[PDB]
Amino acid sequence: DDIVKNLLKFVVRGFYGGSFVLVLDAILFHSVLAEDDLKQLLSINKTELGPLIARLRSDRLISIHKQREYPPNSKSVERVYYYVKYPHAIDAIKWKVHQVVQRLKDGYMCPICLTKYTQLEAVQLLNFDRTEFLCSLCDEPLVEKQDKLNRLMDQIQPIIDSLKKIDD
Amino acid sequence: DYLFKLFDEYDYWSLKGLKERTRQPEAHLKECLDKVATLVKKGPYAFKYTLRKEEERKATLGEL
Amino acid sequence: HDSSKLLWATEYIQKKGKPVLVNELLDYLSMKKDDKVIELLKKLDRIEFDPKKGTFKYLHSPSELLKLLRSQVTFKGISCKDLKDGWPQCDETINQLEEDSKILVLRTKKDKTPRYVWYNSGDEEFVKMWENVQAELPRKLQD
Fold first, then answer.
1. Is A44 exposed, middle or buried (0-12, 13-18, 19+ CB in 10 A)?
2. Is A43 on the interface with C (CB under 8 A)?
3. What miscellaneous comment appears in this entry (chain B)?
């Protein structure tokens, strides 16, 4: 599971800060933990562990099984099982990177009206008397990258190559 | 040194009992006690410090 | 009540600025000659026990921090001040390992000038590009 761990570290470098990366590495060190084990393992509190857990729940990064330890001593035991699910993480990362590339691949506004216009609206907004694009209701004046996205995409390309290596 | 002799004399005591003895603010009493004694916040003795040579400690206090 | 004697003796070793014989301590600290006073010095890491007669002296940071993280491979957190005490003036080394992004440091959510150092187990536009919206059929199409 070294390749999966490397992909998770790359995802930690891309997504969020270092504390989340360290928590994931701590989960990687110890096989299974139940809901209290990170708190014993970490100096962070449980309420703050909760904001981080909510952040992990927002994504597909890891998985939770919810289990009770049955033996009837008091209220028994709420044990949660956090086990990483590789397929969901792979799917979400692919959707994000492809969507990011689509966003990278992918104007008129009036100061007083705060409206917005487009090229088709340009043909409409043109006036013959003056030379300008005029607003519709207020008749106000109208006013109003890829290479940089490509360089940041060079960072995305190493991650894509790592994903290809993980696949085969 | 006197407070420590109380600690062997009492396994449980309070910053109030100590401030009454030492006539010092409880804040100062709470600092040193953190070194010798530990606090139990649960049980009948809750909010009271329990311990963990006494003459050697007293002579060390006299030196310092 | 043997915990206090070690500190009053050690802070005295700092005040005197020189090592003190066990007998000189036991006479100055007015204690019966005993192995426990020496044994507390043998136990305490802030005091050095000297094999020649009695003598008691008071008592590479990035490498020490890396070794501590490696030993910490089972431990998911450590204290910032304790690491500094183990390797005097280690806060700077901890911050440097942080900036290197290996033993990485975590900036204080309490006083923003402080920084914690942590043990290594070893932009939103960029992040949203790396996250965006987050199902099974597109995953199967992805697979």
1. buried
2. yes
3. Present with 520 molecules/cell in log phase SD medium.
